[PDB]
């Protein structure tokens, strides 16, 4: 059931990275977007955000979201999560790091809830193009028409087709830890943490410790506060500094792997044939730019392939050998002459 995914549900931690276009400039958003994969057909997009969707801190859920504000995972009800493109999208399902959504064509993808007192959105420059499966360069999945073996991402989550790495988090920096006691700087740890003390003054440079204080140095701006939180693990993101140790294992299954489904494809209007002596007058009234392919059935193929968008009349020389033409997604047909 839902709770049979503890590996990603329990062990993962929402990490924060450097969104390129966080609102006005590049801030450090908790929803730093990574690995946009718009490689499907019908226009479904898989986005690997830096926030962890679905699971409340308290084991598991789905109506909740876990994002990291500060040193703590301030989880909330997911409520107004946007997934934007040239036009706003409509998300399908969300699972931990990944969120599957269907978008209209565009050149930018932006993600963001709006926690209410603050927005915390993020975008990234990445073109998204949607080629419908078939011979007709349509734009949106139509109500009716024939169906073809398309490829897209399943809405299902309980799959293990592919895996991704997840190791110990790196030494996250946090300046707010370097408080002072009016005589020397005081370090602090919230709970179970083991911070690292480093300062410019000639002193103990290593400073690995629980709650403790500096030896001699006094200038906060002349120190470093690195934080260790190895109790949880994070995704191997390219915007986060590597931990100095071992690549901790644990394969997080990819929630939405591509599958070979069936999409509804458009159906071009039927051509109006008009026979002529050893000549096939073909009246065409395309609705959207559709491929037209024809080939002679004789010894010489004599291929002809050309996209047609504006309604036009084309003619072909149908010899006694015979001729074949495939208009749009219609099944191929054949013809004689006298």
């Amino acid at each position, epitope marked *: 059931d839902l709770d049979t995914h503890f590996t990603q549900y329990k062990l993962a931690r929402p990490y924060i990275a450097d969104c390129p276009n966080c609102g006005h400039s590049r801030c450090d958003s908790p929803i730093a977007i990574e690995e946009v994969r718009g490689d499907a057909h019908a226009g479904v997009i898989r986005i690997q955000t830096s926030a962890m969707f679905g699971l409340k801190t308290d084991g598991v859920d789905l109506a909740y979201m876990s994002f990291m504000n500060g040193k703590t995972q301030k989880s909330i009800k997911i409520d107004n999560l946007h997934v934007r493109t040239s036009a706003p999208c409509s998300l399908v399902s969300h699972h931990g790091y990944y969120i599957l959504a269907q978008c209209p064509p565009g050149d930018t993808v932006t993600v963001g809830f709006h926690d209410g007192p603050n927005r915390h959105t993020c975008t990234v420059a990445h073109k998204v193009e949607f080629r419908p499966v078939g011979r007709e360069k349509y734009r949106h999945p139509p109500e009716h028409g024939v169906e073809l073996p398309c490829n897209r991402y399943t809405h299902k989550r309980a799959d293990q087709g592919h895996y991704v790495e997840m190791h*110990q988090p790196g030494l996250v920096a946090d300046h707010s830890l370097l408080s002072i006691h009016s005589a020397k700087v005081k370090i602090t740890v919230p709970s179970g943490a*083991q911070v690292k003390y480093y300062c410019k003054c000639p002193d*103990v440079r*290593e*400073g*690995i*410790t*629980s*709650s*403790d*204080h500096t*030896t001699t140095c006094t200038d906060v701006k002349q120190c470093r506060a690195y934080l*260790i939180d*190895n109790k949880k693990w994070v995704y191997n993101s390219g915007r986060l500094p590597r*931990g*100095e*140790g*071992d690549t901790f294992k644990g394969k997080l299954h990819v929630p939405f792997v591509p599958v070979k489904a069936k999409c509804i494809a458009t159906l071009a209007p039927e051509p109006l044939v008009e026979h002529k002596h050893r000549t096939l007058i073909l009246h065409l009234h395309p609705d959207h730019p559709t491929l037209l392919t024809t080939r002679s059935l004789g010894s010489d193929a004599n291929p002809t392939r050309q996209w047609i968008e504006r309604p036009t009349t084309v003619n072909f020389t149908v010899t006694g050998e015979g001729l074949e033409y495939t208009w749009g997604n219609h099944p191929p047909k054949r013809v004689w002459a006298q």
Partner: antibody
Amino acid sequence: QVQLVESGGGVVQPGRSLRLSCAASGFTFSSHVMYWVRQAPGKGLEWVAVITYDGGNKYYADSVRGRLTISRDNSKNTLYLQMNSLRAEDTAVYYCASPRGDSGSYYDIDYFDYWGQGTLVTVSS
Amino acid sequence: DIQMTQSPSAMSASVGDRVTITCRASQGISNYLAWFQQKPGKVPKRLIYAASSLQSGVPSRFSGSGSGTEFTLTISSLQPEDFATYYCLQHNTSPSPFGQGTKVEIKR
């Protein structure tokens, strides 16, 4: 059974160098933190140094910093202490030790459970 | 650096006595501290860790208390095998200094 076996102790002149070794067996040596502790004749214990499972971090008491170098060879299950510029104050039994046999990258809270019998270093002319 | 101060440096006690050894850190070490017994000519043996976790296989007569800067080893009823030198160790930071050791001798 977990064993640690120190070797390379002996008599050395002041200002000379000596290399201690500690062979390990009965546990996954390459996964655990290793420590040197010394005890001068008739004195209390003194913490000398520590090295991580990978050797990537190394720490030293201020009394030995710049003169002693801790190292390891995980392929040989062997810990080393290179001692340079030895002084009469470095005369001690040196003990090889580890925490309980459970692993970590740059973390430990089981300090000093398994130890060797120690090797005597005498620094004298 | 951190320094560990043990009090007393030596004490005389009888079999059956309650022995209390105090260790003070020069800076806070939370509860990342351990206690070690050493008999003459032997290797040290750990008795307590985390300032109160009794080591597996060590007698229930040993007990530990304190947090932050002040810590203790309490032997509830001193046995003939307990006459030894006792060390505290802080393990919160590296370097990890031992205390000077407290020698428990037989009172006569």
